[PDB]
Design a protein around this ligand. Sequence first.
Ligand SMILES: *[C@@H]1O[C@H](CO)[C@@H](O[C@@H]2O[C@H](CO)[C@@H](O[C@@H]3O[C@H](CO)[C@@H](O)[C@H](O)[C@@H]3O)[C@H](O)[C@H]2NC(C)=O)[C@H](O)[C@H]1NC(C)=O
Ligand SMILES: *[C@@H]1O[C@H](CO)[C@@H](O[C@@H]2O[C@H](CO)[C@@H](O)[C@H](O)[C@H]2NC(C)=O)[C@H](O)[C@H]1NC(C)=O
Ligand SMILES: *[C@@H]1O[C@H](CO)[C@@H](O[C@@H]2O[C@H](CO)[C@@H](O)[C@H](O)[C@H]2NC(C)=O)[C@H](O)[C@H]1NC(C)=O
Length: 403
Amino acid sequence: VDICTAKPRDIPMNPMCRRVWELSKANSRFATTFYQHLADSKNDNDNIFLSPLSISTAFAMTKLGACNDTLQQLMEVFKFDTISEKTSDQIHFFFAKLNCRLYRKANKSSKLVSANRLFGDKSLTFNETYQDISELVYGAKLQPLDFKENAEQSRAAINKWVSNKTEGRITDVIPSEAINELTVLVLVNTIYFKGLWKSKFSPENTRKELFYKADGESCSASMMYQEGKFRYRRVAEGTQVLELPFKGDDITMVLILPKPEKSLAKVEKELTPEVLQEWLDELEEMMLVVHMPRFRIEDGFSLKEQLQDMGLVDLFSPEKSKLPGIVAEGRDDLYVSDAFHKAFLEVNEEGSEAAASTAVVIAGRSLNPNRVTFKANRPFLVFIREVPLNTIIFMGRVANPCV
Ligand SMILES: *[C@@H]1O[C@H](CO)[C@@H](O[C@@H]2O[C@H](CO)[C@@H](O[C@@H]3O[C@H](CO)[C@@H](O)[C@H](O)[C@@H]3O)[C@H](O)[C@H]2NC(C)=O)[C@H](O)[C@H]1NC(C)=O
Ligand SMILES: *[C@@H]1O[C@H](CO)[C@@H](O[C@@H]2O[C@H](CO)[C@@H](O)[C@H](O)[C@H]2NC(C)=O)[C@H](O)[C@H]1NC(C)=O
Ligand SMILES: *[C@@H]1O[C@H](CO)[C@@H](O[C@@H]2O[C@H](CO)[C@@H](O)[C@H](O)[C@H]2NC(C)=O)[C@H](O)[C@H]1NC(C)=O
């Protein structure tokens, strides 16, 4: 039974505890709710970059061994309870279907790698059903590590493993000394994405240009430039929405650039899944001039603080946590010590994480003289989505791309 074959009865009942999917909707509700809270707590001159899909996946995996209020809190916070027909055992089934299509091994131009792992001290034993379904559905190993007597060796091992999965772009998922002898359970998760643009820019048309920060000042950015046929629409209150697809067309990049006058903080607060979905429905292929800067964002997270604040308390509490999928001789306080996530995105003329020099020659072209222009020389929102599945893979904000 592999992940694409798995049927509903292959994801078992629990211990005692085009078409648009229901799971994808739920994940997008988490994504905009989590993003808004994170952005509201951050200064407007800082870049944000995260993978909500990664976070959702990691915590769905973790709720296999959760129960009672711990499971209830999990289900609520990640908006899994919003999926109409109750059954919380059908979410693992939905993720099997989503993970099978997300992480294929087709020649699909883009590469999408999943790193999803729960690390427990060697004294803990993971239930056999928990291990089995985590492996099948999430491709996740419940990994024993010597935390008690080799804390730092484990941390280096954890960081080394995520490093191998991100091709050396993410080297420190766990920040220094965040793991010790008292660490019991650590959840680590990342998603790594490489892809070439469908319509690449040429480095010879890139040139230093001013970027206007939220503080009022300016800096020098490497502004890329090309002209071509892209899905676009100027929407409510002068906001420019632009989709730049990757080779294959299944993974695209959506940019949300507000007019000069309107603030990006105001757009971040208005952000909803249904406002975003109406914007995509208005987009139309159009011949336009594209100006967008080369940017590189590496944002690392320690999730407990914020997730607790949103209502995920029990899971991180020694008294309150209810995790019957994990067991330890003589211990009744098995809790998650922290959840670590780190995401990376480098965007150039070739695409996402491809650094090549593709010159471009366009012979005999003469475009409309009044064609629309898109110049991203002021903060904008970035969405990396999977079109067929209607899934927000990554999401972020480019508030300062300057060197
Ligand atoms: C980085 O992660 C990749 C996973 O894609 C690791 O590659 C895997 O490495 C193992 C060895 O550690 C390979 O297994 C080989 O199996 C044959 C079959 O018996 C055996 O004769 C070899 O001696 C070895 O055990 C495996 O093929 C390889 N690929 C996969 C898909 O698993 C890579 O090793 C990781 N980096 C480090 C430094 O570990
Ligand atoms: C995994 O969880 C199941 C419960 O869902 C545990 O099964 C219990 O096993 C003991 C004897 O093997 C029985 O007394 C209980 O009746 C079982 N419960 C059920 C509901 O079947 C299983 O032991 C757990 N795994 C570990 C490692 O303990
Ligand atoms: C966790 O929730 C389960 C319900 O799924 C509770 O189990 C109930 O326990 C009582 C007595 O122990 C039984 O009469 C019920 O039949 C059980 N289950 C159901 C389906 O109602 C459990 O008490 C809750 N609390 C803890 C700490 O485990």
